[PDB]
RNA sequence: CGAUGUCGGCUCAUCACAUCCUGGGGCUGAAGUAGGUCCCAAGGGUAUGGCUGUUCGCCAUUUAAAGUGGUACGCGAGCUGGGUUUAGAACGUCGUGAGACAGUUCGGUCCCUAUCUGCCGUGGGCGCUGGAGAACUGAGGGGGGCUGCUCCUAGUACGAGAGGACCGGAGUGGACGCAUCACUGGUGUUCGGGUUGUCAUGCCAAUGGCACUGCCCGGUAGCUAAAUGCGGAAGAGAUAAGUGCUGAAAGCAUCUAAGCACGAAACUUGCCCCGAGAUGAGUUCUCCCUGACCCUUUAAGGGUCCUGAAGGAACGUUGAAGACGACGACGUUGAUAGGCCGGGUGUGUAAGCGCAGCGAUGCGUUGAGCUAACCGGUACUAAUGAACCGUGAGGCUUAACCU
RNA sequence: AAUUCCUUGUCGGGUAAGUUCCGACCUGCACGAAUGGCGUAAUGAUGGCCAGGCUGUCUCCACCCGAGACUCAGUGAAAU
RNA sequence: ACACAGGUGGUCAGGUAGAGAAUACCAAGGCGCUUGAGAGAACUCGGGUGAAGGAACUAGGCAAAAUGGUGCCGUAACUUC
RNA sequence: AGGACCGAACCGACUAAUGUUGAAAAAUUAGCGGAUGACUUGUGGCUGGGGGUGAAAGGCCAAUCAAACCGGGAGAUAGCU
């Protein structure tokens, strides 16, 4: 009956959600803007933004702690080398969701989730 | 909950000693027998501590002249008069419930000494 | 007498001096301020309508704001009404504080209970579950039979079936008031009252003897 | 488990009285591009609240 | 929280060693015995020349439970093993003369006063 | 007979009263306690087990009591399938035999996505006569009514003694119901840790995937119960059986014919909830709208322009609200959600580096690191300016006032 | 007794309590000697009974993880 | 009858752990099962855990839980030895 | 050595649950029995309807069996609907 529980289930089991957000966080760090569904965007915030704040403090333990989460080494290069010093003063709010219509295949409410700089 | 946080800390006793599970503890408890108000002693290993401010408990396990007893105490109760740490104890967990299955030499906790 | 409108702050305990924990519910009762007085000569019944708390200026509508403006009072978060007891007298704009319960000794607390949604009859009506094994085919938590046979050939009214449990007005009666704190605007009653934390309560004196 | 008299077309339309689709109801006009879009969504050219976003 | 079919240990030296509860007395559809509650028991094991022999049906009072008792401050007292003292069936006040193990302050009543005159703790 | 499934168990009831308990009362071969019997009474309550397919019954141990019946011997489009009663097989018996025996024994497929009524919930439309926002009265409807034991009165009354009260009061249980999460706990595949096999990240170290969450150990919030609070009442009214008072018909007698008083868990209220579709559509408070101009088969008629209010709806961020609608909060003059900051909680003293040890490991930095839904803050992100719906003073008759 | 109607025969064992079970009696309605009698070690997805362990079977259910069920988009039956 | 969870003979048979062609994770190689997006009600199905009790369930321990390996010690009645 | 023991392939089908307008006109999942033998399997052959074959159930003989299927006698006959 759910009262105060947090976290979408997304019609997957726990290991498929964990894997899926690991990939999708990797893709948002890599490309800086991805188009996903609106619920997957809204959960991707709570996975991605803690990696940016971990990246705001560069140390070997945070590189390894952000390589346990995310499991990719290019990603923990861009965090800690580019994104962490990019934000660096921005307290939360590393990413915005922009609703962008519906799919054709199944009429799902899409949304572009992007990092909040992209000044390039 | 600044109302509840303000209202509970008006009741928290101040001199609660620092103990952690594994410690042998004597707890002196007010026991009332009709008109006389006695104070009796319950010594045993702390096997569990719940920290919640005013609602902080701790479970002490004794092997009383026969079988084993677990008293859970509310730490900030006025019944619980004294807590004193007899033997500081060295364990690795936080809740020592495995000791419910062990007696004698198996239920033997090393000393901490640091 | 009348009651006051509170707000469920949550639960704590109150250690007595002889070491008896009392589970209390903390009810913040701010200044309930009377917005309307009702007489027999205009309404057929004597009752006061009070408000409490505070509302945003842009969120109160013009009907509602005109009501509180006539009363000469700040807009609150709601309007409630208490029936008067034949020798009581209130004026519009009069503030009523938790101090009213400084004598009462035992109260009744009325709130909306926590909504449990569409509940089945085992949760809702305490029906007993059928066998979990021994042959049972797809009917473990189901309600069983629901009526008789050709005679009546109908299910009677108010047959206990499944549906919305929770989220309705319930009154808990005869709760011992543990403290009245006029400084912090608090009322500590012994026990659980209905509702989640932050829900609006209505605390009256107990009508039972 | 199955019907016992064929239901009419009356009762059929009565059941479908609620199957009606609601219109959009009015879709909003962008600040810069001046073009139309669902509210709180980005436009077909990829603007939102008068600034340029996506740009594919 | 002792119910029917529950094997209890024996705290006194009446001769029984392991008993089974067969009713919880004191009400209709009463489910549980408890802190100091009277039950009816049958004796499932005995020592060879005790006062009570195997398969007798008599009363007992529960003196310790694994579930435990709650004090008025919120403190609980759980034991490790359920135990009873075999009372006499007609006119109570129990059979045995020694009492082993601790008991609780909730047998502080008239009858069980005898049980807490013995009983090395509490 | 172009099919109305038939015992018993379970789940779920529901009515009758010819009442098992509780409540009132008369007679008693009623001293008291406990009874017997009869009248009144249907509010609520009214066992768990052994054996048996069993209903029943016997037994064990409870209980205030373990009621008697109707409801397709209530209930298989709700469950079971043990029994009876298919096809296999055997025993006893009958028949020469095929076979047969409500004699016995072992084995043996129970389908249905609900259209209509009913019922439990929950909405949309319209009405309620201008529109709208709230608060209400209350017709009516439903829920709830069980009860033990201990103590005092009082070891008094009664009785030769044994024994042992009425009436009244206090306490504390059982079963049931409502709420709740402060406590005690359960869960807690979203938090921390231990650990086995194997694979990968180049490798050591560190991590991650997979093996039921790999197996485990703890555990936040929430939900929860075995947890903790509360409830069933007092009181009033009208009575049943029953008891009377005055009092004739019937100069006595007589509770009744006139008149009057008591009298029970039943009845109407008192308590809790729903409740104006209560079309008999009620009340109260507040808010908003104070334009022109044509046409006709001149009507509470139609149309054009200008206006668009109070408010609602949509959209968005959402919620201890939720199947979906609905309901509640917030939308930048803003803490609604996420993030962030601080705290708490949980786990249990991370990684890296140093030292001791041949090494596994241990110790220091270090109660360290990591911490979900929690708590207190913070506009960093997303809650957009607008558009949409809703109008422009609200009919006729009669009456009382226009001071 | 896979056989016994009367029958839950009677006695004993096990159980707090045992129409089943084991032992015995024998009044075998209606056993009985290759349509074999009586024993019988081992074997049996065999029938009946008892006990230890173990447990959500149950007392009495609670929470959680998933797949449907519910909402949206696409396709789109059936008995009657 | 279907682009059907069924049936269909032979041949090859790598790593680590393992007695093993079991089983777990992998290589070569091949796949993600031709409807998806949400939400996170009752109820059904497949599972996890559970306080105290521990067959009281029931026609009946049905189902579930439990046991489970290798070496060594040790092992009763009865027996066709 | 063994119609020997444990256990995969392989053959089977004891229990439960699901499924029962199925994924399937007999299966799936979790356990289950045999597993060097009276075993199992491939390819071919032979036996035919009052006939075959049968470690026997009235089982099996092309989803059909107390007498197959097809065609014919044949518009059998039907005091019955």
From Swiss-Prot, chain B:
Got a GO cellular component term for this one? Answer: cytosol
- Naturally occurring in which organism (per UniProt): Escherichia coli (strain K12)
Q: Is Cell inner membrane found in the keyword set? A: no
The record's subunit annotation is: Part of the 50S ribosomal subunit. Contacts L14. Forms two bridges to the 30S subunit in the 70S ribosome, contacting the 16S rRNA. In pre-50S ribosomal subunits interacts with RsfS, which may inhibit association with the 30S subunit.
Q: Which GO terms of the molecular function aspect are on file?
A: large ribosomal subunit rRNA binding; structural constituent of ribosome
State the similarity comment: Belongs to the bacterial ribosomal protein bL19 family.
What the entry lists under Pfam families is as follows:
Ribosomal_L19
The record's InterPro entries line, in alphabetical order, gives: Ribosomal_bL19, Ribosomal_bL19_CS, Ribosomal_bL19_sf, Translation_prot_SH3-like_sf
GO annotations under biological process? cytoplasmic translation; ribosomal large subunit assembly
Sorted alphabetically, the keyword list is:
Ribonucleoprotein, Ribosomal protein, RNA-binding, rRNA-binding
- SUPFAM superfamilies recorded for this chain? Translation proteins SH3-like domain
What does the entry say induces or represses the expression of this protein? Part of the rpsP-rimM-trmD-rplS operon.
- The name this protein carries in UniProt is Large ribosomal subunit protein bL19
The entry's function note states: This protein is located at the 30S-50S ribosomal subunit interface and may play a role in the structure and function of the aminoacyl-tRNA binding site.
Q: Is the keyword RNA-binding assigned to this protein?
A: yes
UniProtKB/Swiss-Prot annotation, chain C:
Q: Write out the GO MF terms.
A: rRNA binding; structural constituent of ribosome
What does UniProt give as the signal peptide span?
none
N6-succinyllysine: modified positions = 38
Q: Which InterPro entries match?
A: Ribosomal_uL3, Ribosomal_uL3_bac/org-type, Ribosomal_uL3_CS, Transl_B-barrel_sf
Q: Which SUPFAM superfamilies match?
A: Translation proteins (SSF50447)
- Listed GO CC annotations: cytoplasm; cytosol; cytosolic large ribosomal subunit
HAMAP family, alphabetized: Ribosomal_uL3_B
Q: What function is annotated for this protein?
A: One of two assembly initiator proteins, it binds directly near the 3'-end of the 23S rRNA, where it nucleates assembly of the 50S subunit.
Assembly mode: Part of the 50S ribosomal subunit. Forms a cluster with proteins L14 and L19. In pull-down experiments interacts with CedA.
Q: What name has this protein been given in UniProt?
A: Large ribosomal subunit protein uL3
This chain is encoded by the gene named rplC
Swiss-Prot record, chain D:
Q: Which UniProt keywords apply?
A: Ribonucleoprotein, Ribosomal protein
Please report the name of this protein according to its UniProt entry: Large ribosomal subunit protein bL32
Location of region: Disordered? 1-37
Among InterPro entries, the record links this protein to: Ribosomal_bL32, Ribosomal_bL32_bact, Ribosomal_zn-bd
Q: Which organism is it from?
A: Escherichia coli (strain K12)
Matching entries from PANTHER family are given as: 50S RIBOSOMAL PROTEIN L32, LARGE RIBOSOMAL SUBUNIT PROTEIN BL32
**Self-association state and partner proteins as the record states:** Part of the 50S ribosomal subunit. Contacts L17.
Record-stated family: Belongs to the bacterial ribosomal protein bL32 family.
Curated annotation (Swiss-Prot), chain E:
Q: Name one GO biological process term.
A: cytoplasmic translation
What CDD domains does the record tag this protein with?
Answer: Ribosomal_uL14 (cd00337)
Name any one GO molecular function: large ribosomal subunit rRNA binding
**Keyword terms, alphabetized:** Ribonucleoprotein, Ribosomal protein, RNA-binding, rRNA-binding
Phenotype when changing residue 97 to A: Reduced RsfS binding
Q: Which domain of life is it from?
A: Bacteria
Q: Which GO terms describe its cellular component?
A: cytoplasm; cytosol; cytosolic large ribosomal subunit
Q: Which InterPro entries match?
A: Ribosomal_uL14 (IPR000218), Ribosomal_uL14_bac-type (IPR005745), Ribosomal_uL14_CS (IPR019972), Ribosomal_uL14_sf (IPR036853)
Subunit structure comment from the entry: Part of the 50S ribosomal subunit. Forms a cluster with proteins L3 and L19. Forms two bridges to the 30S subunit in the 70S ribosome, contacting the 16S rRNA. In pre-50S ribosomal subunits interacts with RsfS, which may inhibit association with the 30S subunit.
Q: Which HAMAP family does this one have? A: Ribosomal_uL14
Name the family the entry cites.
Belongs to the universal ribosomal protein uL14 family.
Function, in words: Binds to 23S rRNA. Forms part of two intersubunit bridges in the 70S ribosome.
Task: State what protein this is by name.
Answer: Large ribosomal subunit protein uL14
């Amino acid at each position: 009956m759910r009262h105060r529980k947090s976290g979408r289930q997304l019609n997957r089991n726990s290991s498929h959600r964990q894997a899926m957000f690991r990939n999708m966080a990797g893709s948002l760090v890599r490309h800086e803007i991805i188009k996903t569904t609106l619920p997957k965007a809204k959960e991707l915030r709570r996975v991605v933004e803690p990696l940016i704040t971990l990246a705001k403090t560069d140390s070997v333990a945070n590189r390894r702690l952000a390589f346990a989460r995310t499991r990719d080494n290019e990603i923990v290069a861009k965090l800690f080398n580019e994104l962490g010093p990019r934000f660096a003063s921005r307290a939360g709010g590393y990413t915005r969701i922009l609703k962008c219509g519906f799919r054709a295949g199944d009429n799902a409410p899409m949304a572009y989730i992007e990092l909040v700089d992209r000044s390039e | 909950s600044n109302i509840i946080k303000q209202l509970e800390q008006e009741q928290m006793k101040q001199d609660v000693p620092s103990f952690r599970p594994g410690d042998t503890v004597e707890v002196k408890v007010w026991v009332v027998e009709g008109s006389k108000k006695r104070l009796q002693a319950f010594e045993g290993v702390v096997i569990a501590i719940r920290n919640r401010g005013l609602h902080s408990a701790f479970t002490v396990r004794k092997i009383s002249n026969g079988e084993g007893v677990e008293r859970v105490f509310q730490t900030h109760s006025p019944v619980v008069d004294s807590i004193s740490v007899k033997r500081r104890g060295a364990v690795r967990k936080a809740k020592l419930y495995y000791l419910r299955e062990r007696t004698g030499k198996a239920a033997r906790i090393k000393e901490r000494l640091n | 007498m009348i009651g006051l409108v509170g707000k469920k702050v949550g639960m704590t305990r109150i250690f007595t001096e002889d070491g008896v924990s009392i589970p209390v519910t903390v009810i913040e009762v701010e200044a309930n301020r009377v917005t309307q007085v009702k007489d027999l000569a205009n309404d057929g019944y004597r009752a006061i309508q009070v408000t409490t708390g505070a509302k945003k200026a842009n969120r109160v509508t013009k009907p509602e704001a005109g009501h509180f403006a006539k009363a000469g009072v700040e807009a609150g978060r709601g309007l409630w009404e208490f029936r008067l007891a034949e020798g009581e007298e209130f004026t519009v704009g009069q503030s009523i504080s938790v101090e009213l319960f400084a004598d009462v000794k035992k109260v009744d607390v009325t709130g909306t209970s926590k909504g449990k949604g569409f509940a089945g009859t085992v949760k809702r009506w305490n029906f007993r579950t059928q066998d979990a094994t021994h042959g049972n085919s797809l009917s473990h938590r189901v309600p069983g039979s629901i009526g008789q046979n050709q005679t009546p050939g109908k299910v009677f009214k108010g047959k206990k079936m499944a549906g919305q449990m929770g989220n309705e007005r319930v009154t808990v009666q005869s709760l011992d008031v543990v403290r009245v704190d006029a400084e912090r605007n608090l009322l500590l009653v012994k026990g659980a009252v209905p509702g989640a934390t932050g829900s609006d309560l209505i605390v009256k004196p107990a009508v039972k003897a | 488990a199955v019907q016992q008299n064929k239901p009419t077309r009356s009762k059929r339309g009565m059941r479908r009285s609620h199957d009606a689709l609601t219109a959009v109801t009015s879709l909003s006009v962008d600040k810069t591009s001046g073009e139309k879009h669902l509210r709180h969504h980005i436009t077909a050219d990829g603007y939102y609240r008068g600034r340029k976003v996506i740009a594919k | 929280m002792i119910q029917e079919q529950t094997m209890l240990n024996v705290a006194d030296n009446s001769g029984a060693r392991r008993v089974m509860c067969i009713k919880v007395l004191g009400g209709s559809h009463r489910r549980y015995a408890g802190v100091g509650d009277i039950i009816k028991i049958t004796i499932k094991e005995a020592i060879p020349r005790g006062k009570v022999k195997k398969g007798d049906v008599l009363k007992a009072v529960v003196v310790r439970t694994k579930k435990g008792v709650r004090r008025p401050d919120g403190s609980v007292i759980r034991f490790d093993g359920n135990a009873c003292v075999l009372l006499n069936n007609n006119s109570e006040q129990p059979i045995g003369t020694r009492i082993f193990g601790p008991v609780t302050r909730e047998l502080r009543s008239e009858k069980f006063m005898k049980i807490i005159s013995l009983a090395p703790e509490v």
